[PDB]
Amino acid sequence: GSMYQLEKEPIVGAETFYVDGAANRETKLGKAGYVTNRGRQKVVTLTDTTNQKTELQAIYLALQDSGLEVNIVTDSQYALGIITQWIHNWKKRGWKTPVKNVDLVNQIIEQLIKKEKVYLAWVPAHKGIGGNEQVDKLVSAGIRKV
Ligand SMILES: CC(=O)Nc1ccc(S(=O)(=O)N2CCN(C(=O)c3cc(O)c(O)c(O)c3)CC2)cc1
Ligand SMILES: [Mn+2]
Numbered sequence: 001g002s003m004y005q006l007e008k009e010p011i012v013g014a015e016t017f018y019v020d021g022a023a024n025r026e027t028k029l030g031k032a033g034y035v036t037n038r039g040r041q042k043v044v045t046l047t048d049t050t051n052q053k054t055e056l057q058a059i060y061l062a063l064q065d066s067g068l069e070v071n072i073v074t075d076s077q078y079a080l081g082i083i084t085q086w087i088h089n090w091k092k093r094g095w096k097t098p099v100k101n102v103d104l105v106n107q108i109i110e111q112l113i114k115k116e117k118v119y120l121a122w123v124p125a126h127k128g129i130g131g132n133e134q135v136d137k138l139v140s141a142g143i144r145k146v
């Protein structure tokens with residue numbers, strides 16, 4: 001019962017977007033973006049933003065620049081949770097919409113329901129040479145020390 005059933009496993013064959021965002025509390029400066037396993041990449045700079053906002057902004061960018069079937073890998077538990085919860089709880093009784101970032105999550109759900117299939121997965125932030133590590137370096141540049 002939702003406006004969409006998110007996939008339970010990654011969509012085989014589909015481009016994978018490793019999304020990430022980072023923000024500085026003291027300046028409200030931040031960056032959001034993605035790298036994909038087909039060579040794509042994009043990073044945007046943001047103002048008046050938060051860390052949880054930039055993570056949502058990266059997911060929005062991934063949905064805007066992807067095809068009808070997309071795999072999205074985030075290290076943001078909040079981003080995954082608030083999107084999955086919004087999907088799972090609709091047109092039902094005891095649903096109070098989130099307070100903060102309500103406009104951003106709304107625009108994300110807008111893009112989401114326009115897709116064939118979407119797989120959204122959480123991974124812990126980690127070190128290495130994988131997708132989450134590359135996009136982290138791109139969005140942390142000038143925002144936070146690595
Ligand atoms: C309330 C509760 O109990 N837990 C809870 C609540 C919110 C979150 S969080 O919103 O996901 N938050 C976790 C700490 N951060 C990173 O560690 C991080 C690491 C990165 O490498 C990175 O690229 C990145 O964008 C962020 C920022 C994001 C996590 C757990
Ligand atoms: Mn992240």
Ligand SMILES: [Mn+2]
Pocket residue numbers: 020075125132135136137
């Ligand atoms: Mn990171």
Ligand SMILES: [Zn+2]
Pocket residue numbers: 047048
């Ligand atoms: Zn400003």
